[PDB]
Design an enzyme around this catalytic site. Structure first.
Site, PDB file in Angstrom:
ATOM      1  N   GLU A   1       0.810  -1.220   0.000  1.00 53.64           N
ATOM      2  CA  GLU A   1       0.000   0.000   0.000  1.00 53.64           C
ATOM      3  C   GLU A   1       0.852   1.283   0.000  1.00 53.64           C
ATOM      4  OE1 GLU A   1      -2.943   0.046   3.109  1.00 53.64           O
ATOM      5  OE2 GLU A   1      -3.958   1.718   2.080  1.00 53.64           O
TER       6      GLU A   1
ATOM      7  N   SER B   1     -10.690   5.396   6.488  1.00 53.36           N
ATOM      8  CA  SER B   1     -11.405   4.989   7.700  1.00 53.36           C
ATOM      9  C   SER B   1     -10.681   5.546   8.939  1.00 53.36           C
ATOM     10  CB  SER B   1     -11.521   3.448   7.744  1.00 53.36           C
ATOM     11  OG  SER B   1     -12.045   2.913   6.488  1.00 53.36           O
TER      12      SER B   1
ATOM     13  N   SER C   1      -3.435   7.578   8.161  1.00 52.61           N
ATOM     14  CA  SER C   1      -2.032   7.188   8.087  1.00 52.61           C
ATOM     15  C   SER C   1      -1.212   8.376   7.624  1.00 52.61           C
ATOM     16  CB  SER C   1      -1.774   5.996   7.126  1.00 52.61           C
ATOM     17  OG  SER C   1      -2.403   6.170   5.881  1.00 52.61           O
TER      18      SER C   1
ATOM     19  N   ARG D   1       6.150   5.078   6.467  1.00 48.59           N
ATOM     20  CA  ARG D   1       4.985   5.404   7.275  1.00 48.59           C
ATOM     21  C   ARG D   1       5.480   5.984   8.599  1.00 48.59           C
ATOM     22  NH1 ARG D   1       1.199   3.360  11.108  1.00 48.59           N
ATOM     23  NH2 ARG D   1      -0.950   3.651  10.415  1.00 48.59           N
TER      24      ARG D   1
HETATM   25  C1  LIG Z   1       0.482   3.181   4.388  1.00 48.22           C
HETATM   26  C2  LIG Z   1      -1.042   3.139   4.544  1.00 48.22           C
HETATM   27  O1  LIG Z   1      -1.693   4.074   4.177  1.00 48.22           O
HETATM   28  O2  LIG Z   1      -1.628   1.975   5.098  1.00 48.22           O
HETATM   29  C3  LIG Z   1      -2.942   2.070   5.617  1.00 48.22           C
HETATM   30  C4  LIG Z   1      -2.890   2.224   7.143  1.00 48.22           C
HETATM   31  O3  LIG Z   1      -1.810   2.320   7.627  1.00 48.22           O
HETATM   32  N1  LIG Z   1      -4.104   2.275   7.975  1.00 48.22           N
HETATM   33  C5  LIG Z   1      -4.053   2.476   9.417  1.00 48.22           C
HETATM   34  C6  LIG Z   1      -4.329   3.753   9.917  1.00 48.22           C
HETATM   35  C7  LIG Z   1      -4.291   4.049  11.263  1.00 48.22           C
HETATM   36  C8  LIG Z   1      -3.963   3.014  12.138  1.00 48.22           C
HETATM   37  C9  LIG Z   1      -3.852   3.304  13.614  1.00 48.22           C
HETATM   38  C10 LIG Z   1      -2.346   3.501  13.921  1.00 48.22           C
HETATM   39  O4  LIG Z   1      -1.460   3.656  13.108  1.00 48.22           O
HETATM   40  N2  LIG Z   1      -1.944   3.468  15.298  1.00 48.22           N
HETATM   41  C11 LIG Z   1      -0.589   3.635  15.634  1.00 48.22           C
HETATM   42  C12 LIG Z   1      -0.411   4.741  16.659  1.00 48.22           C
HETATM   43  N3  LIG Z   1      -1.369   4.598  17.819  1.00 48.22           N
HETATM   44  C13 LIG Z   1      -0.997   4.982  19.141  1.00 48.22           C
HETATM   45  C14 LIG Z   1      -1.903   4.759  20.188  1.00 48.22           C
HETATM   46  C15 LIG Z   1      -1.448   5.132  21.449  1.00 48.22           C
HETATM   47  C16 LIG Z   1      -0.159   5.651  21.535  1.00 48.22           C
HETATM   48 CL1  LIG Z   1       0.559   6.107  23.052  1.00 48.22          CL
HETATM   49  N4  LIG Z   1       0.608   5.811  20.513  1.00 48.22           N
HETATM   50  N5  LIG Z   1       0.186   5.470  19.312  1.00 48.22           N
HETATM   51  C17 LIG Z   1      -2.783   4.314  17.443  1.00 48.22           C
HETATM   52  C18 LIG Z   1      -2.874   3.269  16.345  1.00 48.22           C
HETATM   53  C19 LIG Z   1      -3.677   1.742  11.657  1.00 48.22           C
HETATM   54  C20 LIG Z   1      -3.742   1.450  10.306  1.00 48.22           C
HETATM   55  N1  LIG Z   2     -19.542   7.310  -0.503  1.00 44.83           N
HETATM   56  C1  LIG Z   2     -18.945   7.122   0.674  1.00 44.83           C
HETATM   57  N2  LIG Z   2     -19.239   6.099   1.487  1.00 44.83           N
HETATM   58  C2  LIG Z   2     -18.602   5.979   2.639  1.00 44.83           C
HETATM   59  N3  LIG Z   2     -17.687   6.794   3.069  1.00 44.83           N
HETATM   60  C3  LIG Z   2     -17.359   7.838   2.294  1.00 44.83           C
HETATM   61  C4  LIG Z   2     -17.981   8.000   1.109  1.00 44.83           C
HETATM   62  N4  LIG Z   2     -17.506   9.083   0.515  1.00 44.83           N
HETATM   63  C5  LIG Z   2     -16.591   9.596   1.323  1.00 44.83           C
HETATM   64  N5  LIG Z   2     -16.497   8.846   2.426  1.00 44.83           N
HETATM   65  C6  LIG Z   2     -15.577   9.112   3.503  1.00 44.83           C
HETATM   66  O1  LIG Z   2     -14.362   8.526   3.119  1.00 44.83           O
HETATM   67  C7  LIG Z   2     -13.866   7.646   4.145  1.00 44.83           C
HETATM   68  C8  LIG Z   2     -13.216   6.455   3.492  1.00 44.83           C
HETATM   69  O2  LIG Z   2     -12.192   6.952   2.619  1.00 44.83           O
HETATM   70  P1  LIG Z   2     -11.160   5.939   2.030  1.00 44.83           P
HETATM   71  O3  LIG Z   2      -9.887   6.685   1.668  1.00 44.83           O
HETATM   72  O4  LIG Z   2     -11.701   5.289   0.808  1.00 44.83           O
HETATM   73  O5  LIG Z   2     -10.927   4.908   3.190  1.00 44.83           O
HETATM   74  P2  LIG Z   2     -10.574   3.372   3.087  1.00 44.83           P
HETATM   75  O6  LIG Z   2      -9.401   3.209   2.159  1.00 44.83           O
HETATM   76  O7  LIG Z   2     -10.244   2.907   4.457  1.00 44.83           O
HETATM   77  O8  LIG Z   2     -11.751   2.657   2.576  1.00 44.83           O
HETATM   78  C9  LIG Z   2     -15.086   7.230   4.957  1.00 44.83           C
HETATM   79  O9  LIG Z   2     -14.712   6.967   6.311  1.00 44.83           O
HETATM   80  C10 LIG Z   2     -15.951   8.501   4.869  1.00 44.83           C
HETATM   81  O10 LIG Z   2     -15.582   9.410   5.909  1.00 44.83           O
HETATM   82 MG   LIG Z   3      -7.469   3.480   2.100  1.00 46.63          MG
END
Ligand SMILES: CC(=O)OCC(=O)Nc1ccc(CC(=O)N2CCN(c3ccc(Cl)nn3)CC2)cc1
Ligand SMILES: Nc1ncnc2c1ncn2[C@@H]1O[C@H](COP(=O)(O)OP(=O)(O)O)[C@@H](O)[C@H]1O
Ligand SMILES: [Mg+2]
Ligand SMILES: CC(=O)OCC(=O)Nc1ccc(CC(=O)N2CCN(c3ccc(Cl)nn3)CC2)cc1
Ligand SMILES: Nc1ncnc2c1ncn2[C@@H]1O[C@H](COP(=O)(O)OP(=O)(O)O)[C@@H](O)[C@H]1O
Ligand SMILES: [Mg+2]
Lengths: 352, 352
Positions: free
Chosen positions: B121, B175, B178, B190
């Site tokens: 990704e 959702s 990142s 990342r």
């Molecule tokens: C490259 C890319 O786009 O891949 C898609 C992707 O990565 N999705 C994704 C998005 C967000 C998350 C959540 C997250 O990263 N964490 C790490 C840091 N956290 C904390 C919590 C407490 C403390 Cl004390 N410190 N840190 C919270 C959880 C996990 C996956």
């Molecule tokens: N048509 C849609 N349906 C659901 N969520 C949407 C829509 N359009 C925009 N969003 C927003 O976009 C977010 C998801 O974006 P996206 O980058 O595609 O996330 P993911 O890759 O995790 O699916 C949702 O959490 C919402 O806030």
């Molecule tokens: Mg995504």
């Protein structure tokens, strides 16, 4: 006059009161009745009216302050009830800090001849924290951490030495969150703040569950499962995301499962309470971690009243800071965490 | 086979489809009917079944890719409906990224002889972003910012040059959130993530208001007043807090006025929607600012679909990053913000 230190916050008023215990025979005679009655009222009650509470377990006994021996008392009540406090006062030098020292300045001045001295909240918090740690908690440590925070069979509260406290990142979780960097007794600053704090926990939890108090919100959260509301890494990937070291149990989207109507219909109030607590607590930890990295500070101490009677959030902070920092940061806690501003204000008294 | 790039996220599937436009006389004969019918179906419909949408305005026309001229198309549908997509496929090399490439791997393999190639990704997002910026948006800038973001009478969308893009902080709001640091075409990582993202906005807003779609949540928020729910600096201090440069309008505690029962009884659904949007958006901006400071990166580009048809959040990010950074950081936006992973996956096709 009675010696008082008051921190008027966005949600609670915190008051520190020094009760002298070395009153002579002559001083007892020369003391006017209203002052005798305030002292008896404060020391012979633990509840004041309907919303005031003395936190007896925090009392510091037989402290020497300003050349007198006394007991230091810790009292709180809602800022919403300050008009009642002021009205009872109208029927003394007041050192006061917090935003309310400004907002309610004119109200305090309705007490005739009262001198209000507004003191800086940063100065008061840092001085109060360093002072209480220096005098100790009746010979016990004021500062503690959770040892082996990653292993629940081992995780236990243990004392932590702050005799050389610098540098220190202070994370003050009240209505909102303020983050302070303390480099010396005379070199400290506000780093930043976040608006996702204790008021967000209580306000969202009240909207979502109908709870009517902080303690009720915590009891609900203690029975809930936040994963019923949150979307986890394993819900998106099917499991752990090894490439970036994300465990399957990490929250990828707080409340993210609530986009589905059928899940909203099955979630309990307790689950929502716990998701609210987890969401706020993890965000605080993550902001604290980012600030510690920028400030190059590895000791993070959490204060404020969001963590009062809240071991869930303390343990979540201890585990999360240690886990996500690969053990480079240590979460520290203080027994008097809600009252340092009030103490620091009291300690400003001799400057007037 | 048709050339496709798919990013299966936690909420949406994003698909990029290259439609050849240089098909010879011989190629048209040698093409099998099912392939002709897939091409006509995709290019002659803008809605696919009940939940699929082609974003016609994003189409890149007359692109040269892999030695052919064609049009690049951008299509999305909910991850919840991937079983319908797979079932229609069962009645080709697939380059796929996102968490769902792993979670749904076995489902894609129910299409006989289909080769699924899961792609990283991070690699896909960065390559897709750099590629679309390099080819331009039909001769227009792919990247834009809001000029004079602090003055509403002046604030307007303006193009931004990324021909030398490094370094770049990429904030992918899906959702969850990142955060990526891009130092070169081959040096990127990342940084961290937060769980307070688009799914939190939609999930909380659905719980609080009963809205049943992202667009409905945004329309509610457009009519609301977040200050009915949030506790501001002026609510605590009475005004601005000059000592730390906090304006009275800054949010001190998100939803913090909802601790009061009478305020919970007077707040509207629209107000709650706007407070949810403001809360999530400000937290994202603040995390982005902290990461930019640690990475020593001053260009912050926001991607993901949280910002689709969401000018409120874009303008809030533009203003807030500029205001809170004293003008040191610039918020940047991309026209194809939801689709870069899908494009990057498509661009991985020649490696197989
Ligand atoms: C490259 C890319 O786009 O891949 C898609 C992707 O990565 N999705 C994704 C998005 C967000 C998350 C959540 C997250 O990263 N964490 C790490 C840091 N956290 C904390 C919590 C407490 C403390 Cl004390 N410190 N840190 C919270 C959880 C996990 C996956
Ligand atoms: N048509 C849609 N349906 C659901 N969520 C949407 C829509 N359009 C925009 N969003 C927003 O976009 C977010 C998801 O974006 P996206 O980058 O595609 O996330 P993911 O890759 O995790 O699916 C949702 O959490 C919402 O806030
Ligand atoms: Mg995504
Ligand atoms: C010393 C002490 O304890 O005093 C008490 C105290 O300070 N209370 C307090 C707590 C929190 C706040 C909120 C806050 O600080 N901010 C600044 C940073 N923000 C953003 C937003 C977007 C972006 Cl892009 N960047 N930053 C959000 C709002 C304000 C007051
Ligand atoms: N008895 C209580 N009443 C209200 N909030 C409480 C109470 N006890 C703990 N809290 C928590 O403490 C937070 C306020 O802590 P505090 O440090 O005193 O903030 P402030 O200085 O802004 O008033 C509340 O937002 C709530 O989460
Ligand atoms: Mg406070």
């Amino acid at each position: 006059s009675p010696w008082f230190g008051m921190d008027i916050g966005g949600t609670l008023v915190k008051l520190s009161y020094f009760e002298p215990i070395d009153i002579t025979a002559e001083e007892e005679q020369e003391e006017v009745e209203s002052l005798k009655s305030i002292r008896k009222y404060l020391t012979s009650n633990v509840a004041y009216g309907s919303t005031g509470i003395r936190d007896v377990h925090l009392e510091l006994k037989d402290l020497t302050l300003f050349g007198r021996r006394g007991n230091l008392h810790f009292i709180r009540f809602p800022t919403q009830d300050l008009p009642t406090f002021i009205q009872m006062g109208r029927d003394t030098v007041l050192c006061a800090t917090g935003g309310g020292a400004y907002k309610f300045e004119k109200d305090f001045r309705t007490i005739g001849n009262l001198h209000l001295h507004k003191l800086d909240e940063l100065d008061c918090l840092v001085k109060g924290l360093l002072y209480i740690d220096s005098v100790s908690f009746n010979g016990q440590a004021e500062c503690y951490y959770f040892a082996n925070a990653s292993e629940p069979e081992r995780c236990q509260k243990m004392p932590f030495n702050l005799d050389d406290p610098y540098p220190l990142l202070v994370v003050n979780i009240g209505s909102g969150v303020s983050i302070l960097a303390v480099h010396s007794k005379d070199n400290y600053k506000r780093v930043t703040g976040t608006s996702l704090g204790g008021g967000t926990f209580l306000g969202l939890c009240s909207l979502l569950t109908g709870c009517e108090s902080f303690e009720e919100a915590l009891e609900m959260a203690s029975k809930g499962d936040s994963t019923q509301a949150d979307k986890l890494v394993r819900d998106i990937y099917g499991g752990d995301y090894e490439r970036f070291g994300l465990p399957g149990w990490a929250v990828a989207s707080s409340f993210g499962n609530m986009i589905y109507k059928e899940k909203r219909e099955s979630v309990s109030k307790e689950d929502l309470a716990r998701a609210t607590l987890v969401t706020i607590t993890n965000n605080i930890g993550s902001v604290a971690r980012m600030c510690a990295v920028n400030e190059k500070i590895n000791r993070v101490v959490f204060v404020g009243n969001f963590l009062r009677v809240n071991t869930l959030s303390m343990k979540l902070l201890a585990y999360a800071l240690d886990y996500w920092s690969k053990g480079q940061l240590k979460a520290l806690f203080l027994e008097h965490e809600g009252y340092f501003g009030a103490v620091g204000a009291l300690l400003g008294l001799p400057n007037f």
